[PDB]
Design a protein around this ligand. Structure first.
Ligand SMILES: COc1ccc(Cl)cc1-c1nn(C)cc1NC(=O)c1cncc2cn(C)nc12
Length: 278
């Protein structure tokens, strides 16, 4: 018996957890005994791209870290089976738990995101989609990177992976090199982390989301990106979140050096946050 093989006959759908343009995540119970005592699992599938999900499955099957959602197996199109985190993403969790998640907890979540991302980069992968919606909450004390749908392998001795396609990109989390040349470096993930940190510090408030704040700064869906690149070239950046200490904001700003080669590393962020937590 292969513990990573989930038979369709016993994989029972319970309800939706979330959905995108092409992907879907559902809560299921894998219930071979048929009495509703089986383990609950999160199941990612595609809406009725298949090659992409097979690549994501193989990436996650080979990642093992406390701040990366656990791979459990497959159901064979194909479905990806993972552990289930009932608290969902930071985007759903933070607005409902502000009283519980103070600055000290926010900085510990920032450390955990950095550790999971640093592990990913050590494996020569660039995530390309780091945002609060992709950070899952295990508990009030732990977060995990929870999706790898856009993840690419950077070739050995190369510094970036080039992605040119017709798909909708999270442009308000993208570094200048991603917007201008579709080049993704590990440092491009650091830029996205700075935006995710801003979301975490604003408790994922929609009125002060990266998209809302950049749209206020820039003033059509087709001219948006050029005005965003120009704003970044001018040295403009997302403002300090409400009640965020300047020392935290300065670490966030080091994520957003214009050139990828000047940005902080994830390990330097971890050390900076650990110094503030002491
Ligand atoms: C990262 O989240 C997503 C990624 C991709 C897509 Cl199509 C949707 C979501 C998502 N949206 N919402 C509202 C809630 C989501 N997920 C979960 O609650 C979830 C829970 N436990 C383990 C999970 C593993 N994954 C991939 N997702 C997991």
């Amino acid at each position: 018996v292969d513990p990573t093989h989930f038979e369709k006959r016993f994989l029972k759908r319970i309800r939706d957890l979330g959905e995108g343009h092409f992907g879907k995540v559902e809560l299921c119970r894998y219930d071979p005994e048929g009495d509703n005592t089986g383990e609950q699992v999160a199941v990612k599938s595609l809406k009725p791209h298949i090659a992409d999900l097979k690549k994501e499955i193989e990436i996650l099957r080979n990642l093992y870290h406390e701040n990366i959602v656990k791979y459990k197996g497959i159901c064979t199109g194909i479905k990806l089976i993972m552990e289930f985190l009932p608290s969902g993403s930071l985007k759903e969790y933070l607005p409902k738990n502000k009283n519980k998640i103070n600055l000290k907890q926010q900085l510990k979540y920032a450390v955990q995101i950095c550790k999971g991302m640093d592990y990913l980069g050590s494996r020569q992968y660039v995530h390309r989609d780091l945002a609060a919606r992709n950070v899952l909450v295990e508990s009030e004390h732990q977060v995990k990177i929870g999706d790898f749908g856009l993840t690419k392998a950077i070739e050995t001795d190369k510094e970036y992976y080039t992605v040119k396609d017709d798909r909708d990109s999270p442009v308000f989390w993208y570094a200048p090199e991603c917007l201008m040349q579709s080049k993704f470096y590990i440092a491009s993930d650091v830029w996205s982390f700075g935006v995710t940190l801003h979301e975490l510090l604003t408790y994922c408030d929609s009125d002060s989301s990266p998209m809302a704040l950049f749209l206020k700064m820039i003033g059509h869906g087709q001219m948006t990106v050029t005005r965003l690149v120009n704003t970044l070239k001018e040295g403009k950046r997302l403002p300090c979140p409400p009640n965020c200490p300047d020392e935290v904001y300065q670490l966030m700003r080091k994520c957003w050096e214009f050139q990828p080669s000047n940005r902080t590393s994830f390990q330097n962020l971890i050390e900076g946050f650990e110094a503030l937590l002491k």
